[PDB]
Amino acid sequence: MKFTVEREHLLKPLQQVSGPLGGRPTLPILGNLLLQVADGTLSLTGTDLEMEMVARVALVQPHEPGATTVPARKFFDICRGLPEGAEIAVQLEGERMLVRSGRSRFSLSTLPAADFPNLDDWQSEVEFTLPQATMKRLIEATQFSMAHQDVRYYLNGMLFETEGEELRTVATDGHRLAVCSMPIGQSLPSHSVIVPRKGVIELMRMLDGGDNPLRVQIGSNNIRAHVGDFIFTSKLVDGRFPDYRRVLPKNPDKHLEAGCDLLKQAFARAAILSNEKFRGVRLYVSENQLKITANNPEQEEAEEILDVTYSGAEMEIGFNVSYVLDVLNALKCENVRMMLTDSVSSVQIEDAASQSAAYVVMPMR
Amino acid sequence: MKFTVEREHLLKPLQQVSGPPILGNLLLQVADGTLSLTGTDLEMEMVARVALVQPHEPGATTVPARKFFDICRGLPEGAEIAVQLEGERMLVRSGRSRFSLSTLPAADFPNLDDWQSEVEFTLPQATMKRLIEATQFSMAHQDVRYYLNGMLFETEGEELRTVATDGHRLAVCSMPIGQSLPSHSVIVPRKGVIELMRMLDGGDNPLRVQIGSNNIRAHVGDFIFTSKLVDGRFPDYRRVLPKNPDKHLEAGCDLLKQAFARAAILSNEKFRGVRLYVSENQLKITANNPEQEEAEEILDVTYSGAEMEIGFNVSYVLDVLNALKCENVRMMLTDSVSSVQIEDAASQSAAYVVMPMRL
Ligand SMILES: [Ca+2]
């Protein structure tokens, strides 16, 4: 195996395929990247046994076919450290891979390509193309509501749902929920799958925000996304996601509307004097007014009064202020609508301008 | 105690006095038309003053520093902040935002003992910043030799000089200040050096320095920083500088830095060192690790002297090269077991001394 590539043609690919890797690989080969030269192309693959990221880099300089694996961090740092425009010459020599550029020489220890863990083959059952921006919107709208290391393995990930001309994402940690739906313009069969947390983040970070379309393929137990010369593949979380439809408040007849930033800044100030562990704030709603209060065990007190639009009955309700701030930070819009029922029921929060995303936050004692 | 003040006028002062249970509080004092804010950690203190034009009433209290700063910071740009003391609570109001903070009495707030100035001089902010930036990375952190966890400030002739060392590497920098000065040396604790550094903002502003037997004070604008000093036997940099180097290496800072950084990738991850081989017009830098991986860099350099091999801790060399931020570097060597001197070729304001590493 031999290739010579310009530094900047290798740097972004190396950074991308190293995504799935950790600082402390469990076994050595999992800290390596698979390098394959075949039919004028260098392929680079990184994996954590659950997902893989693959990059294809075209070879315009002389090359010889073959494959090996080498340490990802060392190989990336070498390439990054070389001067702008450096020509990077690589040659496999059994148990070592040699890297040369100018008068800089490096010998890296290899492990066989034949030992590199391969994701099993599988069959696609649904396929569609969509703008990068749409997948970006779907994930960013909901990512923050995924659980982190919950004993309920099914929540440590994101539901992707195809249904007719709609792609939908759902995320929840049992305390708060986020759902986002976007049109696609192909009619799709009904499928519902759970993408693991780590894979959601990798998918999000592979979107460059240019005009390249994203092509998605989904099987019973795998998902694949192709963007430019990058291919992301992940195993799915083998679980049944609880139904989002049943957690949305049934008849939330008390509607409040107010400016997003005015609400965000008031909650952020009140939060300063909320319980350090539990982060509780109290909302008192009355005619065209929202009063937010916080107090801590030290008997310090914050109060914010805001002009809003509200004509419903007076009520008082408590929330974890971090859950509320997470929603407001994800909306990034002019005005917010909050939909309430009573002091012991969830609130539904949406951008005033659109029902495409919705958030459900349970109240706090 | 009562005052009303623009948020605008409090922000920078609050930032500075938070620099250093009652040590988690800020002391607030209204007197003679001024609000003074003080933060301390018992070893040092920072004082900021702000003028009060709106109706105010004298008095003092202490309040949680981070909460008060965060409240002020979180209010909208242009906000007016009205404060009113009421027993064990301090009331803060701006628009229809209202806060009640728990207080501890001003009388409980620690004061540094009174002390007397023995040496005094004024110099530009910029000169003090340069002196600290040039040397601070060579301070020890948590050495049992406490007097190395800090920085020497020395007056000699018309110069102010800083010296820092951790026993393995040393940094020294001197600047003229245009006054004849007495010969004098004190050690400032590392946390004080850092806080002093952070109080200086790149403006053209005179800085007034007062040194006592046990304290140092610096006044800039309406900020006053005071620290205790460290009492110990600081090494003489004159005895650390190589007496007679007979080997001279010159190269571009960037080329040297980038070669060192690359070679270090395949050094031992726990103690990263590289080997230098110097010969006629050439530098070779090599590294290896327990996996038997190897790096080699060859550089065209200016070199005079006998051929020799010598090792270095990468981080010590990179720290120096990062503090030079200039075109050409000189390394002055003696033999494989002796320290080297590193300097900018075009400036004699600063010098660095680094022990070799055995590989
Ligand atoms: Ca104003």
Q: 3-class DSSP state for residue A311?
A: coil
Residue A133, judged by CB atoms within 10 A of its CB (0-12, 13-18, 19+), counts as middle
Counts for chain A of helices (H) and strands (E), in that order? 6, 22
Q: What are phi and psi of A299, to 5 degrees?
A: 65, 30
Residue of B73, B262, B285, B300 for testing the chain A interface, max A β-carbons within 10 Å: B262
- CB–CB of A298 and B97 under 8 A? no
- CB–CB of B258 and A109 under 8 A? no
Task: Classify the phi-psi angles of B42: left when phi > 0, otherwise alpha if psi is within -120 to 50, otherwise beta.
Answer: left
- Tell which residue, B158, B156, B164, has the closest CA to residue B131: B164
Which pair of tokens denotes residue A288? 């065209």
CATH code of the domain occupying B241-359: 3.10.150.10
Looking at domain A124-247, its CATH superfamily turns out to be: DNA Polymerase III, subunit A, domain 2 (3.10.150.10)
Find the chain B residues whose C-beta atoms sit closer than 8 A to any C-beta of A.
67, 70-71, 74-76, 96-102, 258-259, 261-262, 265-266, 291-299
Sequence-ordered alpha helix ranges (H) in A158-309: 197-205, 260-271
Which pair of tokens denotes residue A85? 């425009």
Distance (Å, whole) CA A101 – CA B106:
66
A154 assigned ligand-binding residue: yes
CATH second-level architecture of B117-240? Roll (3.10)
Find the chain A residues whose C-beta atoms sit closer than 8 A to any C-beta of B.
74, 77-78, 81-83, 103-109, 265-266, 268-269, 272-273, 298-306
The DSSP symbol for A111 reads B
* Resolution of this entry, Å: 1.8
User: B304: which strand partners?
Assistant: B248
Q: Please enumerate in sequence order all residues whose Cβ is within 8 A of that of B289, keeping only pairs 6 or more positions apart, or say none.
A: B266, B267, B268, B269
A7 assigned ligand-binding residue: no
- CB–CB of B258 and A298 under 8 A? no
CB B269, CB A23: distance < 8 Å: no
Polymer length in residues for chain B: 359
- Cα torsion at B269, B272, B273, B274 (round to 10°)? 60
Distance (Å, whole) CA A287 – CA A30:
60
- CB–CB of B97 and A303 under 8 A? yes
Number of neighbouring beta carbons within 10 Å of residue B184: 12
CATH fold for domain B1-116: DNA Polymerase III; Chain A, domain 2 (3.10.150)
Q: What are phi and psi of A231, to 5 degrees?
A: -125, 120
Domain definitions of chain A by residue range:
1-123, 124-247, 248-365
Distance (Å, whole) CA B28 – CA B350:
41
Longest Cα separation, chain A: 78
- Tell which residue, B5, B119, B15, B99, has the closest CA to residue B52: B5
Closest CB to A106: pick one of B75, B96, B266.
Answer: B266
Query: Pairing between strand B25-31 and B34-40?
Result: antiparallel
- CB–CB of B99 and A74 under 8 A? no
* B12-30 burial: b if 16+ Cβ within 10 Å, else e: ebbebbbbbeeeebbbbbb
Classify domain A1-123 at the CATH class level. Answer: alpha beta
Tokens 């290496």 correspond to B249
- Tell which residue, A254, A280, A303, has the closest CA to residue A364: A280
Residue of B nearest to A101 (CA): B297
Residue of B nearest to A97 (CA): B293
**Domain A248-365 grouped into CATH 3.10.150.10:** yes
- CB–CB of B258 and A74 under 8 A? no
Please write down the HEC assignment for all residues of chain B. CEEEEEHHHHHHHHHHHCCCCHHHEEEEEEECCEEEEEEECCCEEEEEEEECCCCCECEEEEEEHHHHHHHHHHCCCCCEEEEEEECCEEEEEECCEEEEEECECHHHCCCCCCCCCCEEEEEEHHHHHHHHHCCHHHCCCCCCCHHHCEEEEEEEEEEEEEEEECCCEEEEEEEEEEEEEEEEEEEEEHHHHHHHHHHCCCCCCEEEEEECCCEEEEEECCEEEEEECECCCCCCHHHCCCCCCCEEEEEEHHHHHHHHHHHHCCCCCCCCEEEEEEECCEEEEEEECCCCCEEEEEEECEEECCCEEEEEEHHHHHHHHHHHCCCEEEEEECCCCCCEEEEECCCCCEEEEECCCCC
CB B115, CB B150: distance < 8 Å: no
CB A258, CB A290: distance < 8 Å: yes
Residue of A nearest to B67 (CA): A272
Fold agreement (A1-123, A124-247): yes
User: B251: which strand partners?
Assistant: B329
CB B178, CB B170: distance < 8 Å: no
In Å, what is the CA distance from B15 to each residue of A76, B18, B69, B70, B194?
A: 39, 5, 7, 10, 14
In Å, what is the CA distance from A222 to each residue of A136, A154, A188, A226, A290?
A: 20, 15, 17, 14, 47
Solving technique? X-ray
CA dihedral (B51, B53, B54, B60) positive or negative: positive
Q: Please enumerate in sequence order all residues whose Cβ is within 8 A of that of B160, keeping only pairs 6 or more positions apart, or say none.
A: B121, B123, B127, B128, B131, B153, B154, B174, B175, B177, B181
